[PDB]
Design a binder for this molecule. Sequence first.
Ligand code: AMP
Length: 504
Amino acid sequence: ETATTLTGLLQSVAKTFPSRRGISLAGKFDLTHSHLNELVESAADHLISAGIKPNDVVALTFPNTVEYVILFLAVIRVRATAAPLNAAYTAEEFEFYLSDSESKLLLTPLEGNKPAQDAASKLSIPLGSASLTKSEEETKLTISLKHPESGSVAKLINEPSDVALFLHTSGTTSRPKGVPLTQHNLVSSVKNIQSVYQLTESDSTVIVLPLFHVHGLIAGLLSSLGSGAAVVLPAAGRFSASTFWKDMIQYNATWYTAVPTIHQIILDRHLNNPEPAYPKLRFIRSCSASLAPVILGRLEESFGAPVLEAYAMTEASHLMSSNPLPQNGPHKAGSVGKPVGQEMAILDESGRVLEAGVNGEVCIRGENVTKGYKNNEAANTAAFLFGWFHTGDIGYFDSDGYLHLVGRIKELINRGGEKISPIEVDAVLLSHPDVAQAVAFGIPDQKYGEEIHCAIIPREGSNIDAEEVLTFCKKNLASFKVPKKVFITDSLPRRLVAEHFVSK
Ligand SMILES: Nc1ncnc2c1ncn2[C@@H]1O[C@H](COP(=O)(O)O)[C@@H](O)[C@H]1O
């Protein structure tokens, strides 16, 4: 009996392990698989009542809270599409993402999200909030609509083809591409992640990544719940260095997944403030940005768990390749391991499958890969050349078929796992009336791996400064995307600009 649907897999988990711990708010309360399912079903009923019909996009801007986990599964449950969005976005960003995703409802915490609410208000998109009260008197997920539609979920059968998760990604055009991930895509990816790491109901983990990115959402939350394993959300609604190990120990965690920058903080936290003992984990996971072999070495030596580096992207519904469990094979530093439940080939510009050791574009094919970018035949033409999905990454296979990432064909600045389009930031800078030309570029950074700076040629006669350019960018871009330095110059000739203004 194999699930055709993520909703169906999670319902299968509710039935099989109804009493087992599903999700917890660290040091506050625990929800069983069956209780979470009842809450998801109740929230689903409320989304129907609110007028959410199949294929409708419901935008979600929350921290990593149980409210978000219920709503997300409830949106998917009623055959609607979850469009999670970074709460840290500007009104200008929120306006585009809500607009381009055709969001017909925005949900925030009770405190709200003013930039997101400003965007929805202007786009005439209905607003609501969600709050979970779990006291001795009641347990209730209150969905409060500002514009209520009304004053059930039996007839609704989820289909594999149903778009469940919608996320934006960057490529060539300054307008982010829309990535529709099906009910079929996510359950395919959960099986891959469950398989390679052999996740079981006895596993538990602490979420230290944002649940609006596929890493935290699919590998962290959904792959755990689909496996019947337990998920623990830190009280802070985000990664907390001080509570991390207290929460891992108290909730008997067997594994965690983070990015190198998070691992770095946890390592430094082990030097200054060592725990008396550390819980023996099955494995520690790294993804999203290249893990330095030194870090991998330190993590393993410090915590005594095998560190397994993986390679994931949104279009692939997260996981593409991973180093295996030590029991199943070796893990190699500076490698992202072998493909998992999908075909992977190294292709030259002509679509020739290159032999081992030769650098080409890493291309994938599998049930976890998006049908294609939403209403964007141009992007899909290039992205699906020769019947493979083109990642935009340059890499090679060694004799054992282990992938090594050595470069990028696409223009990205990977800032500690967060993706910054130089093309999107160029569009913002060029839009400034006193800016004539602008080039946002990437440089090496000890902490974040890469960092964004920019170089500007101002409109002849204007007296613009870095402070003006920064202030303006901060109104239009999220702080992580904003260039940290602005080199105002006379002429531009990008790799060449980065080669010029880089420091020694
Ligand atoms: N282990 C890794 N090392 C280096 N880059 C990575 C790694 N995993 C993922 N990436 C990059 O992250 C991209 C996916 O971005 P996203 O869709 O935001 O997850 C990939 O195409 C790579 O460029």
